[PDB]
RNA sequence: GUUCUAUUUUGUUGGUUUUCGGAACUGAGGCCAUGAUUAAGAGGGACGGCCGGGGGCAUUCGUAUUGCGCCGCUAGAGGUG
């Protein structure tokens, strides 16, 4: 729990997988390989009404909690891997993506490299919804 | 030339071949300014270099999706106004 015993001034790098859907948000800090996870907090465990799991406020609270104990385990800097639902479904990030990423910068964490890792297909299976679409 | 053959012809009876004519068949000729319009901003076909998610058969790659096996950490995740 004391982290790595390494000289001062360096930055131990981790990666946070920011998965921002339209109905909740994930903030998931792991080590460089991604094999070993460290902190995982969603907007759903920080808000009471599930209509607000994807709200930008819940993401900022979720990001603060992750970064708060991320210092505790020794990590000082992060690589950012933003992600939308993607796949066969939408490919734009949800509302909570910006607040969660902004909060990490303000929480004292150091930002490394930001990249989008949305799972886009070459071409996919048939998309949910009829031929006339989700009509309302 | 051959065959059949109208009929004229030998003072008048009779027999044969002519030729003269008619019709058909068959040789060697000479002669014609000797005889085939053009080549459709019609078409068909040939040939030459290309062109195209045209067609059929086989082959190859790509993420994504679903499922499964293992590893990590966790209490929610999904969905909706
Ligand atoms: Mg229906
Ligand atoms: Mg309408």
PDB file of C-alpha atoms (C1' of nucleotides) and ligand atoms in Angstrom:
ATOM      1  CA  UNK A   1       0.000   0.000   0.000  1.00  0.00           C
ATOM      2  CA  UNK A   2       3.070   2.219   0.337  1.00  0.00           C
ATOM      3  CA  UNK A   3       3.698   2.002  -3.411  1.00  0.00           C
ATOM      4  CA  UNK A   4       7.054   1.771  -5.160  1.00  0.00           C
ATOM      5  CA  UNK A   5      10.167   2.864  -3.274  1.00  0.00           C
ATOM      6  CA  UNK A   6      11.684   5.053  -5.984  1.00  0.00           C
ATOM      7  CA  UNK A   7      13.632   8.316  -5.932  1.00  0.00           C
ATOM      8  CA  UNK A   8      11.915  11.690  -5.682  1.00  0.00           C
ATOM      9  CA  UNK A   9      10.981  13.839  -8.667  1.00  0.00           C
ATOM     10  CA  UNK A  10      10.124  10.964 -10.996  1.00  0.00           C
ATOM     11  CA  UNK A  11       6.577  10.132 -12.086  1.00  0.00           C
ATOM     12  CA  UNK A  12       5.187   6.617 -11.757  1.00  0.00           C
ATOM     13  CA  UNK A  13       2.797   6.309 -14.689  1.00  0.00           C
ATOM     14  CA  UNK A  14      -0.627   4.728 -14.604  1.00  0.00           C
ATOM     15  CA  UNK A  15      -3.489   4.689 -17.078  1.00  0.00           C
ATOM     16  CA  UNK A  16      -7.126   5.588 -16.421  1.00  0.00           C
ATOM     17  CA  UNK A  17      -9.792   4.145 -18.715  1.00  0.00           C
ATOM     18  CA  UNK A  18     -12.484   6.830 -18.853  1.00  0.00           C
ATOM     19  CA  UNK A  19     -15.596   5.087 -20.190  1.00  0.00           C
ATOM     20  CA  UNK A  20     -18.324   7.728 -20.544  1.00  0.00           C
ATOM     21  CA  UNK A  21     -21.666   6.354 -21.710  1.00  0.00           C
ATOM     22  CA  UNK A  22     -24.930   8.267 -21.972  1.00  0.00           C
ATOM     23  CA  UNK A  23     -26.279   6.756 -18.744  1.00  0.00           C
ATOM     24  CA  UNK A  24     -23.211   6.469 -16.476  1.00  0.00           C
ATOM     25  CA  UNK A  25     -19.444   7.004 -16.389  1.00  0.00           C
ATOM     26  CA  UNK A  26     -16.439   4.864 -15.451  1.00  0.00           C
ATOM     27  CA  UNK A  27     -13.072   6.003 -14.102  1.00  0.00           C
ATOM     28  CA  UNK A  28     -10.639   3.095 -13.930  1.00  0.00           C
ATOM     29  CA  UNK A  29      -6.986   3.630 -12.990  1.00  0.00           C
ATOM     30  CA  UNK A  30      -4.661   0.662 -13.547  1.00  0.00           C
ATOM     31  CA  UNK A  31      -0.925   0.153 -13.982  1.00  0.00           C
ATOM     32  CA  UNK A  32       0.835   0.444 -17.345  1.00  0.00           C
ATOM     33  CA  UNK A  33      -0.026  -3.071 -18.517  1.00  0.00           C
ATOM     34  CA  UNK A  34      -3.684  -2.703 -17.551  1.00  0.00           C
ATOM     35  CA  UNK A  35      -3.589  -6.213 -16.083  1.00  0.00           C
ATOM     36  CA  UNK A  36      -3.671  -5.009 -12.462  1.00  0.00           C
ATOM     37  CA  UNK A  37      -6.395  -2.546 -11.531  1.00  0.00           C
ATOM     38  CA  UNK A  38      -5.992  -0.065  -8.702  1.00  0.00           C
ATOM     39  CA  UNK A  39      -9.081   2.128  -8.395  1.00  0.00           C
ATOM     40  CA  UNK A  40     -12.454   1.835 -10.129  1.00  0.00           C
ATOM     41  CA  UNK A  41     -15.216   4.338  -9.356  1.00  0.00           C
ATOM     42  CA  UNK A  42     -18.379   5.022 -11.342  1.00  0.00           C
ATOM     43  CA  UNK A  43     -20.828   7.880 -11.227  1.00  0.00           C
ATOM     44  CA  UNK A  44     -23.454   5.438  -9.995  1.00  0.00           C
ATOM     45  CA  UNK A  45     -21.747   4.803  -6.661  1.00  0.00           C
ATOM     46  CA  UNK A  46     -21.476   8.559  -6.049  1.00  0.00           C
ATOM     47  CA  UNK A  47     -25.073   9.665  -6.768  1.00  0.00           C
ATOM     48  CA  UNK A  48     -28.420   8.552  -5.373  1.00  0.00           C
ATOM     49  CA  UNK A  49     -30.803   8.871  -8.336  1.00  0.00           C
ATOM     50  CA  UNK A  50     -29.847   6.724 -11.320  1.00  0.00           C
ATOM     51  CA  UNK A  51     -31.063   9.449 -13.686  1.00  0.00           C
ATOM     52  CA  UNK A  52     -27.840  11.279 -12.742  1.00  0.00           C
ATOM     53  CA  UNK A  53     -25.168   8.580 -13.115  1.00  0.00           C
ATOM     54  CA  UNK A  54     -24.155  10.173 -16.430  1.00  0.00           C
ATOM     55  CA  UNK A  55     -24.411  13.720 -15.088  1.00  0.00           C
ATOM     56  CA  UNK A  56     -21.162  15.717 -15.314  1.00  0.00           C
ATOM     57  CA  UNK A  57     -21.301  16.323 -11.553  1.00  0.00           C
ATOM     58  CA  UNK A  58     -21.115  12.610 -10.736  1.00  0.00           C
ATOM     59  CA  UNK A  59     -18.056  12.220 -12.965  1.00  0.00           C
ATOM     60  CA  UNK A  60     -16.223  15.016 -11.155  1.00  0.00           C
ATOM     61  CA  UNK A  61     -16.980  13.393  -7.799  1.00  0.00           C
ATOM     62  CA  UNK A  62     -15.911  10.013  -9.185  1.00  0.00           C
ATOM     63  CA  UNK A  63     -12.659  11.480 -10.509  1.00  0.00           C
ATOM     64  CA  UNK A  64     -11.887  13.146  -7.173  1.00  0.00           C
ATOM     65  CA  UNK A  65     -12.307   9.873  -5.279  1.00  0.00           C
ATOM     66  CA  UNK A  66     -10.063   7.963  -7.700  1.00  0.00           C
ATOM     67  CA  UNK A  67      -7.304  10.576  -7.622  1.00  0.00           C
ATOM     68  CA  UNK A  68      -7.568  10.944  -3.838  1.00  0.00           C
ATOM     69  CA  UNK A  69      -6.523   7.355  -3.132  1.00  0.00           C
ATOM     70  CA  UNK A  70      -4.417   7.188  -6.298  1.00  0.00           C
ATOM     71  CA  UNK A  71      -1.941   9.386  -4.427  1.00  0.00           C
ATOM     72  CA  UNK A  72      -2.267   6.995  -1.483  1.00  0.00           C
ATOM     73  CA  UNK A  73      -1.058   4.030  -3.551  1.00  0.00           C
ATOM     74  CA  UNK A  74       1.852   6.123  -4.871  1.00  0.00           C
ATOM     75  CA  UNK A  75       0.806   7.013  -8.427  1.00  0.00           C
ATOM     76  CA  UNK A  76       1.578  10.599  -9.441  1.00  0.00           C
ATOM     77  CA  UNK A  77       0.775  10.762 -13.172  1.00  0.00           C
ATOM     78  CA  UNK A  78      -1.647   9.144 -15.605  1.00  0.00           C
ATOM     79  CA  UNK A  79      -2.085   8.310 -19.260  1.00  0.00           C
ATOM     80  CA  UNK A  80      -5.617   9.037 -20.459  1.00  0.00           C
ATOM     81  CA  UNK A  81      -7.611   6.545 -22.548  1.00  0.00           C
ATOM     82  CA  UNK A  82     -10.975   8.120 -23.304  1.00  0.00           C
ATOM     83  CA  UNK A  83     -13.664   5.785 -24.600  1.00  0.00           C
ATOM     84  CA  UNK A  84     -17.255   5.937 -25.798  1.00  0.00           C
ATOM     85  CA  UNK A  85     -19.640   3.004 -26.152  1.00  0.00           C
ATOM     86  CA  UNK A  86     -18.595   2.588 -29.776  1.00  0.00           C
ATOM     87  CA  UNK A  87     -18.911  -0.833 -31.322  1.00  0.00           C
ATOM     88  CA  UNK A  88     -22.191  -1.012 -33.179  1.00  0.00           C
ATOM     89  CA  UNK A  89     -23.562   1.922 -31.141  1.00  0.00           C
ATOM     90  CA  UNK A  90     -22.693   5.616 -30.858  1.00  0.00           C
ATOM     91  CA  UNK A  91     -19.086   6.798 -31.035  1.00  0.00           C
ATOM     92  CA  UNK A  92     -19.207  10.170 -29.303  1.00  0.00           C
ATOM     93  CA  UNK A  93     -18.170  10.475 -25.644  1.00  0.00           C
ATOM     94  CA  UNK A  94     -20.825  11.100 -23.039  1.00  0.00           C
ATOM     95  CA  UNK A  95     -21.309  14.290 -21.057  1.00  0.00           C
ATOM     96  CA  UNK A  96     -19.249  13.106 -18.091  1.00  0.00           C
ATOM     97  CA  UNK A  97     -16.024  12.616 -20.053  1.00  0.00           C
ATOM     98  CA  UNK A  98     -14.951  16.258 -19.796  1.00  0.00           C
ATOM     99  CA  UNK A  99     -15.621  16.734 -16.078  1.00  0.00           C
ATOM    100  CA  UNK A 100     -13.830  13.532 -15.070  1.00  0.00           C
ATOM    101  CA  UNK A 101     -10.742  14.398 -17.119  1.00  0.00           C
ATOM    102  CA  UNK A 102     -10.728  18.013 -15.908  1.00  0.00           C
ATOM    103  CA  UNK A 103     -11.007  16.936 -12.265  1.00  0.00           C
ATOM    104  CA  UNK A 104      -7.915  14.719 -12.474  1.00  0.00           C
ATOM    105  CA  UNK A 105      -5.850  17.693 -13.641  1.00  0.00           C
ATOM    106  CA  UNK A 106      -7.174  19.856 -10.802  1.00  0.00           C
ATOM    107  CA  UNK A 107      -6.764  17.082  -8.212  1.00  0.00           C
ATOM    108  CA  UNK A 108      -2.964  17.218  -8.550  1.00  0.00           C
ATOM    109  CA  UNK A 109      -2.425  14.297 -10.924  1.00  0.00           C
ATOM    110  CA  UNK A 110      -0.086  14.850 -13.867  1.00  0.00           C
ATOM    111  CA  UNK A 111      -1.400  14.184 -17.366  1.00  0.00           C
ATOM    112  CA  UNK A 112       0.619  12.101 -19.806  1.00  0.00           C
ATOM    113  CA  UNK A 113      -0.779  11.156 -23.212  1.00  0.00           C
ATOM    114  CA  UNK A 114      -4.453  11.384 -24.189  1.00  0.00           C
ATOM    115  CA  UNK A 115      -5.846   9.087 -26.870  1.00  0.00           C
ATOM    116  CA  UNK A 116      -9.240   7.795 -27.955  1.00  0.00           C
ATOM    117  CA  UNK A 117      -9.640   4.012 -27.848  1.00  0.00           C
ATOM    118  CA  UNK A 118     -13.268   3.727 -28.918  1.00  0.00           C
ATOM    119  CA  UNK A 119     -13.963   0.273 -30.408  1.00  0.00           C
ATOM    120  CA  UNK A 120     -14.902   1.167 -33.987  1.00  0.00           C
ATOM    121  CA  UNK A 121     -15.640  -1.789 -36.298  1.00  0.00           C
ATOM    122  CA  UNK A 122     -14.520  -2.456 -39.821  1.00  0.00           C
ATOM    123  CA  UNK A 123     -18.158  -3.219 -40.384  1.00  0.00           C
ATOM    124  CA  UNK A 124     -20.483  -4.516 -37.734  1.00  0.00           C
ATOM    125  CA  UNK A 125     -23.530  -6.656 -37.104  1.00  0.00           C
ATOM    126  CA  UNK A 126     -27.038  -5.248 -37.396  1.00  0.00           C
ATOM    127  CA  UNK A 127     -27.768  -2.404 -34.992  1.00  0.00           C
ATOM    128  CA  UNK A 128     -30.515  -2.651 -32.387  1.00  0.00           C
ATOM    129  CA  UNK A 129     -33.697  -0.895 -33.409  1.00  0.00           C
ATOM    130  CA  UNK A 130     -35.971  -1.644 -36.309  1.00  0.00           C
ATOM    131  CA  UNK A 131     -35.653  -0.540 -39.911  1.00  0.00           C
ATOM    132  CA  UNK A 132     -37.811   2.514 -39.133  1.00  0.00           C
ATOM    133  CA  UNK A 133     -35.614   3.429 -36.168  1.00  0.00           C
ATOM    134  CA  UNK A 134     -36.347   4.303 -32.558  1.00  0.00           C
ATOM    135  CA  UNK A 135     -39.338   6.489 -33.382  1.00  0.00           C
ATOM    136  CA  UNK A 136     -40.967   8.770 -30.817  1.00  0.00           C
TER     137      UNK A 136
ATOM    138  C1'   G B   1     -23.460 -32.674-137.957  1.00  0.00           C
ATOM    139  C1'   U B   2     -27.553 -36.336-135.919  1.00  0.00           C
ATOM    140  C1'   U B   3     -32.701 -37.573-135.574  1.00  0.00           C
ATOM    141  C1'   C B   4     -37.691 -36.963-136.851  1.00  0.00           C
ATOM    142  C1'   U B   5     -39.876 -34.371-140.635  1.00  0.00           C
ATOM    143  C1'   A B   6     -43.580 -30.393-144.041  1.00  0.00           C
ATOM    144  C1'   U B   7     -43.405 -30.941-148.663  1.00  0.00           C
ATOM    145  C1'   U B   8     -41.578 -28.288-154.266  1.00  0.00           C
ATOM    146  C1'   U B   9     -39.218 -31.120-157.802  1.00  0.00           C
ATOM    147  C1'   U B  10     -38.376 -36.211-161.878  1.00  0.00           C
ATOM    148  C1'   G B  11     -45.287 -35.993-168.676  1.00  0.00           C
ATOM    149  C1'   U B  12     -49.102 -40.437-165.910  1.00  0.00           C
ATOM    150  C1'   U B  13     -48.435 -45.056-162.162  1.00  0.00           C
ATOM    151  C1'   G B  14     -44.538 -46.924-158.469  1.00  0.00           C
ATOM    152  C1'   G B  15     -39.237 -47.781-154.808  1.00  0.00           C
ATOM    153  C1'   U B  16     -34.627 -44.934-152.735  1.00  0.00           C
ATOM    154  C1'   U B  17     -31.580 -40.781-151.639  1.00  0.00           C
ATOM    155  C1'   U B  18     -30.934 -35.504-152.174  1.00  0.00           C
ATOM    156  C1'   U B  19     -31.591 -30.390-151.731  1.00  0.00           C
ATOM    157  C1'   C B  20     -35.299 -27.102-150.445  1.00  0.00           C
ATOM    158  C1'   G B  21     -38.327 -26.158-145.637  1.00  0.00           C
ATOM    159  C1'   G B  22     -40.030 -27.157-140.195  1.00  0.00           C
ATOM    160  C1'   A B  23     -38.853 -28.981-135.059  1.00  0.00           C
ATOM    161  C1'   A B  24     -35.470 -31.098-131.464  1.00  0.00           C
ATOM    162  C1'   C B  25     -30.437 -32.809-130.041  1.00  0.00           C
ATOM    163  C1'   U B  26     -25.225 -31.868-130.514  1.00  0.00           C
ATOM    164  C1'   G B  27     -19.360 -29.537-132.144  1.00  0.00           C
ATOM    165  C1'   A B  28     -15.774 -25.742-133.305  1.00  0.00           C
ATOM    166  C1'   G B  29     -15.810 -20.616-133.361  1.00  0.00           C
ATOM    167  C1'   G B  30     -15.655 -15.104-133.727  1.00  0.00           C
ATOM    168  C1'   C B  31     -17.725 -11.124-131.155  1.00  0.00           C
ATOM    169  C1'   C B  32     -19.627  -7.757-126.506  1.00  0.00           C
ATOM    170  C1'   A B  33     -15.905  -1.256-123.931  1.00  0.00           C
ATOM    171  C1'   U B  34     -18.008  -8.852-122.728  1.00  0.00           C
ATOM    172  C1'   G B  35     -21.078  -9.296-117.563  1.00  0.00           C
ATOM    173  C1'   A B  36     -20.394  -7.868-109.894  1.00  0.00           C
ATOM    174  C1'   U B  37     -23.165   0.534-108.531  1.00  0.00           C
ATOM    175  C1'   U B  38     -21.346   2.580-104.251  1.00  0.00           C
ATOM    176  C1'   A B  39     -19.278   1.540 -99.660  1.00  0.00           C
ATOM    177  C1'   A B  40     -24.693   4.962 -95.356  1.00  0.00           C
ATOM    178  C1'   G B  41     -22.327  10.331 -89.301  1.00  0.00           C
ATOM    179  C1'   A B  42     -27.405   1.997 -91.318  1.00  0.00           C
ATOM    180  C1'   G B  43     -25.867  -2.637 -89.479  1.00  0.00           C
ATOM    181  C1'   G B  44     -23.038  -7.340 -88.519  1.00  0.00           C
ATOM    182  C1'   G B  45     -18.063  -9.329 -87.877  1.00  0.00           C
ATOM    183  C1'   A B  46     -12.584  -9.141 -87.437  1.00  0.00           C
ATOM    184  C1'   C B  47      -8.297  -6.632 -85.251  1.00  0.00           C
ATOM    185  C1'   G B  48      -5.334  -3.083 -81.400  1.00  0.00           C
ATOM    186  C1'   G B  49      -4.524  -0.697 -76.690  1.00  0.00           C
ATOM    187  C1'   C B  50      -7.087   0.249 -72.688  1.00  0.00           C
ATOM    188  C1'   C B  51     -11.588   0.666 -69.093  1.00  0.00           C
ATOM    189  C1'   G B  52     -15.275  -0.546 -65.298  1.00  0.00           C
ATOM    190  C1'   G B  53     -18.190  -2.037 -56.925  1.00  0.00           C
ATOM    191  C1'   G B  54     -20.304  -5.874 -64.664  1.00  0.00           C
ATOM    192  C1'   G B  55     -20.811 -12.046 -64.032  1.00  0.00           C
ATOM    193  C1'   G B  56     -19.335 -16.916 -61.900  1.00  0.00           C
ATOM    194  C1'   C B  57     -15.801 -20.011 -59.053  1.00  0.00           C
ATOM    195  C1'   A B  58     -11.919 -20.326 -55.417  1.00  0.00           C
ATOM    196  C1'   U B  59      -8.829 -17.674 -51.914  1.00  0.00           C
ATOM    197  C1'   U B  60      -7.301 -13.973 -48.295  1.00  0.00           C
ATOM    198  C1'   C B  61      -7.610 -10.081 -44.548  1.00  0.00           C
ATOM    199  C1'   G B  62     -10.018  -6.741 -40.983  1.00  0.00           C
ATOM    200  C1'   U B  63     -11.842  -4.911 -36.588  1.00  0.00           C
ATOM    201  C1'   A B  64     -16.476  -5.311 -34.223  1.00  0.00           C
ATOM    202  C1'   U B  65     -20.450  -8.537 -31.777  1.00  0.00           C
ATOM    203  C1'   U B  66     -21.837 -12.884 -28.786  1.00  0.00           C
ATOM    204  C1'   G B  67     -20.007 -16.814 -25.940  1.00  0.00           C
ATOM    205  C1'   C B  68     -16.170 -19.371 -23.146  1.00  0.00           C
ATOM    206  C1'   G B  69     -11.316 -20.122 -20.099  1.00  0.00           C
ATOM    207  C1'   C B  70      -8.002 -17.715 -16.840  1.00  0.00           C
ATOM    208  C1'   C B  71      -6.049 -13.199 -14.109  1.00  0.00           C
ATOM    209  C1'   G B  72      -7.255  -8.016 -11.145  1.00  0.00           C
ATOM    210  C1'   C B  73     -10.150  -5.009  -8.234  1.00  0.00           C
ATOM    211  C1'   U B  74     -14.550  -4.066  -6.621  1.00  0.00           C
ATOM    212  C1'   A B  75     -20.952  -3.123  -5.465  1.00  0.00           C
ATOM    213  C1'   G B  76     -23.495  -2.100  -8.345  1.00  0.00           C
ATOM    214  C1'   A B  77     -24.276  -2.668 -13.834  1.00  0.00           C
ATOM    215  C1'   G B  78     -27.863  -2.097 -17.481  1.00  0.00           C
ATOM    216  C1'   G B  79     -31.734   0.680 -19.530  1.00  0.00           C
ATOM    217  C1'   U B  80     -35.491   5.405 -19.707  1.00  0.00           C
ATOM    218  C1'   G B  81     -38.443  11.555 -20.263  1.00  0.00           C
TER     219        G B  81
HETATM  220 MG1  LIG C   1     -40.432  -2.822 -32.208  1.00  0.00          MG
HETATM  221 MG1  LIG C   2     -41.786  13.162 -33.882  1.00  0.00          MG
END
